[PDB]
DNA sequence: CCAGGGCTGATCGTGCAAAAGTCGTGCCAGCCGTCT
DNA sequence: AGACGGCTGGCACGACTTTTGCCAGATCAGCCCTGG
């Protein structure tokens, strides 16, 4: 559903999905690099909230 | 439709947040403790019978620290969504039903 | 007169041909509701 | 001379793995860049009405089937029909050969004659002669439909039948002797043929979007027009403070180190993206200064230039400017162009001056279009016209240019007045 | 494919009587989906393709 | 308790040049218009 | 009907643009160890 035609701007259905996808990708990429407990726990809390 | 792996465990907000608490009624755990443990700020204990500690009790960060420093590596505890999953998976239902 | 896709064309054909017969099938909105329910952690399906 | 292995002097060069990555960084588009930059951001932890309208549309092919449904036929006729009108373009002639369609049926019983039938039945549907299978006959079908009463009908029918080559090479002298038609009366038969709608499917789909994102902007504030970059487009990284305030107080070597390394990376990457931007604005700016000319004037008024021209106005190397110009589009009052574009070959005119080929090639297009239609201007004749202007191009240059503008030859654009 | 039953196989539905509802399993969710998404990118504006 | 020596790490660095590519213009072949 | 002139386009050959490919090192400053 593009409003102006140049940008589709999917709202209310793809924003949260995008949010969750990038946060889970960052968490999965950081969990393998032996990250400290505080950072990974904050990332998991943020993913849970998302 | 599609699927997402989500390597990290995640609870369903439709449960344990409605008028009746499903995880609460299954684990005999109050709502505040579950809400505090589902955000990495409660550090609930999973198992451990040798130490003088209850099965489902809240142990704060300093509390968990002084417990691990004294009892050693015996009082295993988790602070994430995996804690509820471990407390709900390693629990028989028929024995609890008979006890109730 | 509804979202049934496989029924509108058939009804139009029957009216143009003069048959006056209805084939209900199944509305698409029920399938959309099923998909939206399956989008969460709740299984749902129809038996036989 | 003599052969030996001595040593020379005076030069300057230096490079490293990480700096390299910083340099390739400006060679790729923001949209494609922001992708590369999102990827960095996963690796680095300290660097940060439901259906609206949804109006389902017609679609031509969709239109073709709606009448397929209310045409009467058998299951085999409705099967071939779905096959046929499955394979049909936006323009409307069919993509696949008819013998191919027979291979798509995979039935021994199915025959070419049977296909000839279902096809032709749906060949006069909506709009007229659609599913053509190579126009010549499409025209012939639309002819087919309307009344005998209109004059010159048989004439247009004769030509269209088997004298297509005659009309495509616009050799009307040959056409006249072959078809033995009227002198400058055939003209009107040909005019009939002219108004018959080639490409009758196109019509349906018309709703086409707006889509282009300008990198830079340049816009006539009082003369001396000034470049500013696109704010929305420009990518930007911002340091995470939480994690910045959790490196010192950190109690372990693992953690502490971990956090330092990343901060190092991160600060560097910021600084590198910041660089990209500045270059490109400095550079944008330096190219439109020289090419002040062009915006008001038109494509004709462009000065011929080389990268050197714009590299020596800045302090950067040539290659660097070459990497930053690729795929950036800069929006201006006149329109959207690629930044590449400005740059072209020169050719040497009269009076010592040089002319941008682009501008000459724009010039050729106006000159060739605005000519007597009975007598087309040939290339060499033009070369001579330009030479009056002073350009002194030569004839193959002009052929080159004249064929580049997707315009065919002079003897080939000749037509009846 | 004989191209005469493939089109008729599309327009087909079951009884669908006695619809039930229960909890979902990870195996069932994996069986419901065909592919896994990994990038938050929705659409590209260079060629307008998936 | 104060000055001297060691050592680690933090910091600074967007170009030079080699080869591939394009450019314009000429040379030559093949088709077509027109006069004899 | 045949030769001549014009037209176009392919291909070639210099003069000239442009596009990709490099990969540290040494040097300086603060802190810790040790001598005065």
Residue of D394, D417, D399 lying closest to D409 (CA atoms):
D399
> What pairs with residue C2 in β-bridges?
none
Closest chain D residue by Cα to residue C16: D70
Beta partners for residue E19, in sequence order:
C46
**Can you list the pairs that E15-18 forms with residues at least 24 positions away whose Cβ atoms lie under 8 Å?**
E15/C48, E16/C26, E16/C46, E16/C48, E17/C46, E17/C47, E17/C48, E18/C46, E18/C47, E18/C48
Q: Could you tell me the CA-to-CA distances from C20 to C1, C9, C23, D75, E8 in Å, in that order?
A: 14, 13, 10, 21, 22
Beta-carbon contacts of residue C11 (< 8 Å; ≥ 6 apart): C22, C23
Q: Which two tokens stand for residue A39?
A: 């950072």
Chain C contact present for D70, CB below 8 A = yes
Contact B79, B68 (CB under 8 A): no
Q: Which residues pair with D67 in a beta bridge?
A: none
Please give the backbone phi and psi of residue D217, each rounded to the nearest 5 degrees, phi first: -125, 140
CB D160 within 8 A of CB D198: no
8 Å CB contact between C39 and E26: no
- CA nearest to E8 within chain C: C6
Spatial contact of D230 and D217, defined as CB atoms under 8 Å apart: yes
Q: Which chain D residue is nearest to residue C15, measuring alpha carbons?
A: D70
Which residues fall within 8 angstroms of residue D339, CB to CB, at 6 or more apart? D215, D216, D284, D287, D325, D328, D329, D330
- DSSP-assigned letters across all residues of B43-99: -EE---SSSS--SS-B--HHHHHHHHHHH-TTS-EE-SHHHHHHHHHS--HHHHHHH
DSSP track, D306-350: -HHHHHSSSSS-HHHHHHHHTT-EEEETTEEEEGGGG---EEE-T
Task: List CB contacts (< 8 A) between B14 and chain C.
Answer: 40-42
Contacts of D391 (CB under 8 A, 6+ apart): D347, D349, D350, D355, D360, D363
Answer whether E33 sits within 8 Å of B3, measured CB to CB: yes
C7-12, long-range: CB < 8 A, 24+ apart: C9/D66, C9/D69, C12/D69, C12/D70
Sign of CA dihedral C31, C33, C34, C35: positive
* D129 in Cβ contact with D143 (< 8 Å): no
Token reading at D114: 């049977």
Phi, psi of D228 (to 5 degrees): -135, 145
Chain-centroid distance of CA B97 in Å reads 20
C8 Cβ under 8 Å from any chain B Cβ: no
Check if A24 contacts E (Cβ < 8 Å).
Answer: no
Q: How many CB atoms lie within 10 A of CB D135?
A: 18
Contact C45 E19 (CB under 8 A): yes
Cα separation, D344 vs D340, in Å, equals 9
User: Closest residue of A to D41, CA-based?
Assistant: A26
Nearest alpha-carbon partner for A24 in A2, A10, A1, A43: A43
Distance CA D15, CA D315 (A): 19
Radius of gyration of chain E (CA): 19
Planar angle of CA D357, D358, D362, nearest 5 degrees: 115
Output phi, psi for D404, to 5 deg: -75, -35
Buried-state track D43-52, b at ≥16 Cβ within 10 A, e below 16:
ebbbbeeeee
In angstroms, what CA-CA distances link B52 with B67, B70, B77, B87, D91? 10, 11, 14, 18, 82
Q: Peptide bond preceding D334: is omega within 30 degrees of 0, i.e. cis?
A: no
Contact B44, B33 (CB under 8 A): yes
Burial degree of B59 (CB within 10 A; 0-12, 13-18, 19+): buried
Q: Alpha carbon D228 to chain centroid distance? A: 26
**Pick from C19, A9, C6: nearest CA to E45:** A9
Contact (Cβ atoms closer than 8 angstroms) between residue D232 and residue D215:
no
8 A C-beta contact, residue D216 and residue D163: no
- Cβ pair E25:C43 closer than 8 A: yes
Report residue E7 as tokens: 């089109």
DSSP state at residue D154: H
DSSP H or E run through D218? strand D216-218
| CB pair distance less than 8 Å for C38 and B1 | yes
Size of chain A, expressed as the number of residues it contains: 50
Which residues are paired to D393 by β-bridges?
none
d(CA D236, CA D81): 55
- The resolution of the experimental structure, rounded to one decimal in Å, is 3.5
Q: Using a CB-CB distance cutoff of 8 angstroms, which residues of chain A are in contact with residue D43?
A: 29-30, 33
How far is the C-alpha of B12 from the C-alpha of A49, rounded, in Å? 11
* Backbone φ and ψ of D275, nearest 5°: -60, -55
Q: Give the residue from C1, A10, B1, A5 showing the smallest Cα distance to D52.
A: A10
First to last CA, chain C: 27
- Cβ of A10 within 8 Å of Cβ of E39? The answer is no
Tokens of C21: 């017969």
Pairing relation of β-strands B77-78 and B44-45?
antiparallel
Taking only residues 10 to 39 of chain A, the set having a beta carbon closer than 8 angstroms to any beta carbon of chain B reads 20-21, 24, 27-28, 31
Closest partner CB to E2 (pick from D82, D83, D107)? D107
Residue D266 contacts by C-beta under 8 Å, 6 or more apart in sequence?
Answer: D44, D46, D47, D237, D239
Query: How far in angstroms lies nucleotide F21's C1' from the CA of residue D344?
Result: 14
CB atoms within 10 A of CB D373: 10
CA distance D216 to D329: 7
Largest CA distance in chain E: 49
Q: What's the Cα-to-Cα distance from B7 to each of A23, B4, E40, rounded to whole Å?
A: 12, 9, 17
Looking at beta carbons, which residues of chain E come within 8 Å of C35? none
Residues 6+ apart with CB under 8 A from D329: D212, D213, D214, D215, D336, D337, D338, D339
Distance, in Å, from the CA atom of D234 to the CA atom of D274, rounded to the nearest integer, reads: 10
Give just the sign of the alpha carbon dihedral A28, A30, A31, A36: negative
CA–C1' distance D312–F19 (Å)? 23
DSSP code of residue E23: E
Judge whether D72 and D122 are in contact, CB under 8 Å.
no
**Cα–Cα distance for residue pair E31/D305, rounded to 1 Å:** 61
Chains C and E, touching by 3 or more CB pairs within 8 angstroms: yes
* Cα–Cα–Cα angle for D82, D83, D85, rounded to 5 degrees: 70
| Angle, vertex CA D159, rays to CA D154 and CA D163, nearest 5 | 155
Taking the C1' atom of every nucleotide in all shown strands and the CA of D18, the nearest one is G23
Q: Sheet of D216-218: strands edge to edge? A: D227-229, D216-218, D329-332, D335-338
Q: Which residue has the tokens 């036989």?
A: C48
Nucleotide G33 C1' to residue D17 CA (A)? 36
Residue D225 CA to residue E7 CA, distance in Å, equals 63
C34: left (phi over 0), alpha (psi -120 to 50) or beta: alpha
CB D240 within 8 A of CB D48: yes
CA-CA-CA-CA torsion sign (D128, D133, D139, D145):
negative
Radius of gyration of chain D (CA): 32
Breaks in chain E follow which residues, C to N over 2.5 Å?
Answer: none
CB D318 within 8 A of CB D307: yes
Residue D30: both structure tokens together: 């923001």
Which DSSP state fits E20? E
- List CB contacts (< 8 A) between D66 and chain C: 9
């Amino acid at each position: 559903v593009p409003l102006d035609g140049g940008r589709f701007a999917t709202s209310d259905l793809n924003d949260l999905y995008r949010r969750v996808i990038n946060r889970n990708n960052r968490l999965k990429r950081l969990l393998d690099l032996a990250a400290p407990d505080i950072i990974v726990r904050n990332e998991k809390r943020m993913l849970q909230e998302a | 439709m599609g699927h997402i792996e989500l390597a990290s465990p995640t609870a369903h907000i439709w449960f344990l947040k409605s008028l009746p608490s499903r995880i609460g009624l299954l684990l005999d755990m109050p709502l505040r403790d579950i809400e505090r443990v589902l955000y990495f700020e409660s550090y609930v204990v999973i198992e451990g019978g040798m130490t003088n500690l209850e099965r489902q009790q809240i142990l704060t960060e300093e509390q968990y620290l002084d417990a691990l420093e004294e009892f050693g590596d015996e009082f295993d505890a988790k602070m994430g969504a995996e804690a509820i999953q471990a407390l709900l998976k390693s629990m028989d239902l028929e024995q609890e039903c008979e006890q109730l | 007169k509804s979202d049934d896709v496989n029924g509108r064309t058939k009804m139009y054909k029957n009216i143009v041909d003069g048959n006056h017969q209805m084939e209900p099938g199944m509305p698409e909105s029920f399938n959309v509701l099923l998909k939206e329910i399956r989008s969460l952690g709740i299984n749902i399906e129809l038996e036989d | 001379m003599k052969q030996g292995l001595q040593l020379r002097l005076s030069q300057q060069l230096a490079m490293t793995p990480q700096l390299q990555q910083a340099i390739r960084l400006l060679q790729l588009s923001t949209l494609e860049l922001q992708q590369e930059l999102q990827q960095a951001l996963e690796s680095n932890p300290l660097l940060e009405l439901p259906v609206y309208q949804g109006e389902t549309t017609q679609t031509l092919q969709d239109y073709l089937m709606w009448q397929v449904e209310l045409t009467p036929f058998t299951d085999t006729d409705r099967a071939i029909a779905t096959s046929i009108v499955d394979a049909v373009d936006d323009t409307g002639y069919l993509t696949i050969q008819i013998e191919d369609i027979v291979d798509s049926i995979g039935d021994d019983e199915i025959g070419l004659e049977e296909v000839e039938a279902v096809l032709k039945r749906i060949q006069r549907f909506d709009p007229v002669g659609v599913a053509a299978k190579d126009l010549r006959d499409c025209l012939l079908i639309q002819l087919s439909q309307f009344a005998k009463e209109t004059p010159w009908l048989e004439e247009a029918r004769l030509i269209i039948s088997d004298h297509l080559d005659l009309l495509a090479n616009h050799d009307f002298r040959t056409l006249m002797r072959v078809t033995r038609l009227k002198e400058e009366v055939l003209k009107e038969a040909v005019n009939l043929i002219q108004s018959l709608d080639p490409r009758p499917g196109q019509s349906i789909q018309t709703s086409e979007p707006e889509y282009v994102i300008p990198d830079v902007l340049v816009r006539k504030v009082s003369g001396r027009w000034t470049v500013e970059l696109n704010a929305d487009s420009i990518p930007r990284l911002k340091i995470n403070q939480q994690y910045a305030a959790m490196g010192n107080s950190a109690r372990n070597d693992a953690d502490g180190q971990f956090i330092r390394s990343n901060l190092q990376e991160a600060r560097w990457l910021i600084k590198s993206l910041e660089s990209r931007n500045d270059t490109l604005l400095r550079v944008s700016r330096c190219i439109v200064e020289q090419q002040q000319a062009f915006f008001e004037q038109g494509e004709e008024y462009m000065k011929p230039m080389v990268l050197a021209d714009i590299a020596q106005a800045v302090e950067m190397h040539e290659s660097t400017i070459s990497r930053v110009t690729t795929q950036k589009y800069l929006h201006s009052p006149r329109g959207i162009f690629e930044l590449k574009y400005f740059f072209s070959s020169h050719v040497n005119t009269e009076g010592g001056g040089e002319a941008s080929s682009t501008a000459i090639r724009a010039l050729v297009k106006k000159l060739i279009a605005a000519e007597n239609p009975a007598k087309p201007l040939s290339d060499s004749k033009l070369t001579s016209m330009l030479s009056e202007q002073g350009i002194m191009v030569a004839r193959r240059t002009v052929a080159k240019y004249r064929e580049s503008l997707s315009i065919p030859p002079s003897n080939q654009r000749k037509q009846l007045v | 494919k004989d191209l005469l039953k493939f089109l008729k196989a599309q327009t087909k539905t079951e009884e669908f009587d006695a619809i039930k509802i229960a909890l979902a399993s990870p195996d069932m969710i994996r069986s419901w989906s065909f592919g896994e998404v990994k990038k938050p990118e929705t659409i590209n504006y260079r060629t307008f393709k998936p």
